[PDB]
Amino acid sequence: KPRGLFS
Amino acid sequence: KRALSRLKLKLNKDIVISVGIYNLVQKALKPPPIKLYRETNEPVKTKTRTF
Amino acid sequence: IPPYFVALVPQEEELDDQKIQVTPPGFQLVFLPFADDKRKMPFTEKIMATP
Amino acid sequence: CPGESLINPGFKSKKPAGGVDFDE
Amino acid sequence: NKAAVVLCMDVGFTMSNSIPGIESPFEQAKKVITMFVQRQVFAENKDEIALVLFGTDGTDNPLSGGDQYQNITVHRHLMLPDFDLLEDIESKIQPGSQQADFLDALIVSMDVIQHETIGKKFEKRHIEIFTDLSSRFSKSQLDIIIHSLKKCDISLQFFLPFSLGGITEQQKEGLEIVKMVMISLEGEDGLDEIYSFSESLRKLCVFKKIERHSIHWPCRLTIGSNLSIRIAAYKSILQERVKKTWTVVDAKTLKKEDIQKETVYCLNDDDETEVLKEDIIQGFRYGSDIVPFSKVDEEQMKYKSEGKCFSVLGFCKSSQVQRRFFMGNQVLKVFAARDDEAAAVALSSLIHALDDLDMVAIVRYAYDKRANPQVGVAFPHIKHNYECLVYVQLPFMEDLRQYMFSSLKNSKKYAPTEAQLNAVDALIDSMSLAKKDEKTDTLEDLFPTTKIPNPRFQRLFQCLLHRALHPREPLPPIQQHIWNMLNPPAEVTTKSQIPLSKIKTLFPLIEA
DNA sequence: AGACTTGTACTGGAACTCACGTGAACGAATGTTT
Known part of the structure; x- marks a missing residue:
């Protein structure tokens, strides 16, 4: 679940 | 029959074998239209330019 | 032209009853999609069907 | 060679397009 | 958003x-x-x-x-x-x-x-x-x-x-x-x-990758004139291009308004007359002659169809639809219509029936009224989370090419020897890009190409950024990590070093 | 001497194929009007 700085 | 391209398959930097690429299924299109003069009914040459 | 990853799948010669080729021998070049050539789909609940 | 077309030599003779014909 | x-x-x-x-x-x-x-x-x-x-x-x-x-x-x-x-x-x-x-x-x-x-x-x-x-x-x-x-x-x-x-x-x-x-x-x-x-x-x-959004296409899957299932189609796989295009701008003013493109037609006579755009009618070629065919007449005689069709011409065994005949530039995923339990049940029934029978549905597809009708194959795709039909186009009679190629098994002068076959076997074994999980459950892919981003866009963005921030220097080289992701793990090359030497020693390759 | 025929090599155009651009058309969301 890539989210945050990576999305 | 006609080869799309003749290429080189490289197993390594030294081993190379020549191959040919063909297409066994190609979409069929209507022949392209050609512009014609309304009056005399003879082809007209087209050109494009920018200024 | 930017490179594209492809796969060569071998093909075995197959002849009909009348001994006429219907599948030539060679390799079949099939293009492999990149990461960006796919698209995301909406989520749909799975509903089963009775036998 | 059997199946060679009588109009364009060197090409396989295409069978007529029959569409969908349901089996028995 | x-x-x-x-x-x-x-x-x-x-x-x-x-x-x-x-x-x-x-x-x-x-x-x-x-x-x-x-x-x-x-x-x-x-x-x-x-x-x-x-x-x-x-x-x-x-x-x-x-x-x-x-x-x-x-x-x-x-x-x-x-x-x-x-x-x-x-x-x-x-x-x-x-x-x-x-x-x-x-x-x-x-x-x-x-x-x-x-x-x-x-x-x-x-x-x-x-x-x-x-x-x-x-x-x-x-x-x-x-x-x-x-x-x-x-x-x-x-x-x-x-x-x-x-x-x-x-x-x-x-x-x-x-x-x-x-x-x-x-x-x-x-x-x-x-x-x-x-x-x-x-x-x-x-x-970041180019993430376009696919717009749902609603239609009805029809089996005859009595059965109808409401379906929505999305585009799953397609070749992706750049959303923006290069705009030609004047050399000195650097403005797009300062240039203009136009086309002119002139007769083939020596005097080089000028014929206006309204003076040209489109014609075709029929052997050695030219047949005038106005656009209006073509529209009158054009093949007219009723658009938005997803019809089931028939059902056929999966073996008969080969993968080398697929045509088109898209793959469609067909789901049941949104917020419709009945359509979901109907589509699930059809998918399960096709899977059990090992069958596919030959269908006619038209995006809209002015889109040329297509004949394609819809085959089941069942997964643990979701199940859907997958549609890919199929060839007409005109798109098939009948070429004859010489056989390789029966050729006398190209038959490899046993040592050559053993060498090629060693090469294939050494350069394997998949590994079994301790011979326990399944296979694992060592070089998954589907997850590699397209290098073209990475290169383009690098060069654009470098030209914006450093407006004088030349464009840089290609970064090393792009080449690394476009090449396989070093283990494969390390294992393949020797088999390739054997291959070079056995096969007498000479360039003409 | 001269003229035609045959063999080798080269160059330009035809045809075919792919990439890129432009034009028109459309379902869904939003804003405006009653």
Whole structure:
């Protein structure tokens, strides 16, 4: 679940 | 029959074998239209330019 | 032209009853999609069907 | 060679397009 | 649709004092934020980003109060990222010589996001922290911090120079505090949401992919004139091109308005007469002659069809539909219509029947009234989560090419010998790109090409960025990591070194 | 001497194929009007 700085 | 391209398959930097690429299924299109003069009914040459 | 990853799948010669080729021998070049050539789909609940 | 077309030599003779014909 | 991201950055003196080999946190953090800004700038998702720094000499915040909320400056406010941010990150941001409380940094970030998010529908709200956790601080408000985070539903992420999550007691206390905050906000799942700098770099070294949205296509799957199932189709796989195109601009004025393109037709006579656009009628070629055929007459005689058809011409065994005959430039995924239980049941019945019988459906497809009708194959695709039909076009009679090729098995002069076959067997064995899981369950792919981004866009974005920021230098070379991702693991080459030597020794390859 | 025929090599155009651009058309969301 890539989210945050990576999305 | 006609080869799309003749290429080189490289197993390594030294081993190379020549191959040919063909297409066994190609979409069929209507022949392209050609512009014609309304009056005399003879082809007209087209050109494009920018200024 | 930017490179594209492809796969060569071998093909075995197959002849009909009348001994006429219907599948030539060679390799079949099939293009492999990149990461960006796919698209995301909406989520749909799975509903089963009775036998 | 059997199946060679009588109009364009060197090409396989295409069978007529029959569409969908349901089996028995 | 949009996300507001507040980049909280530490500029304390502790980061500056570090071993040169360790790549002191300042450079790593600057590079990380720069790469994030590039990814967002060249992926226009309309995401707003703001920049706040704690640990600087100056003080500029909405709240001043007493000695608290000091040494913190809001360098950037919420807005669309742009090149100015990249320039400021590169040089404008410099380390300070003070210390600040990262808790106060979180407080100011909360205040800024809450104050600036008004009037805009930001669905997400992320706050990122870049600190060494090496500054003395006191915890006296964590309860209200967590309460506000829960009430406002604000996501929080942390980045530290280290991996665990050889350190001082202050670092241990900071790790404990960040762990407690993350646990309280999310829970057990939140433990892994702390990313070191190197780990973050390993993921932010590639420009974001082109993510277009497919618009649902509604229609009816028809089996005869009595059965009808409501379906929605999406485009699953297609070749992706650049959303924007090069615009030709004048050499000196550098304006698009200053140029104009036009086409003129002139007769083939010596005098080179001029014929206006209304004076030309389209004609075709019929052998050795030319047959005039006006556009209006063609429209009158054109093949007319009733659009938006998804009809089942028939059902056929899967073996009869080969994969080398697929045509077209798209693959469609057909689902049941949204919010329709009956359609879902009907489509599930059809999919399961086809799968059990090992069959596919030959269908007629027309996107709209003016789209040429197509004949294609819909075959089942059942997965644990969802099941759908997959549609791919099939060839007409006109698109088939009848070429005859000489056989290779029966050729006398090209038959390989046994030693050659053994050498090629060794080569194939050595260069395997898949591995069995200890001969236990299944296979694993060593070079998955479906997950590799397209190098064209990466190259284009690199060159565009380099020309924007350095408007004089030539375009750089191709980065090394692109070539690395376009080449297989070094193990394959190491194993293949010797078999290729044998192949060279056995097969007498000579160039003519 | 001269003239035609045959063999080798070269160059330009035809045809075919792919990439890129432009034009027109459309379902869904949003804004405006009653």
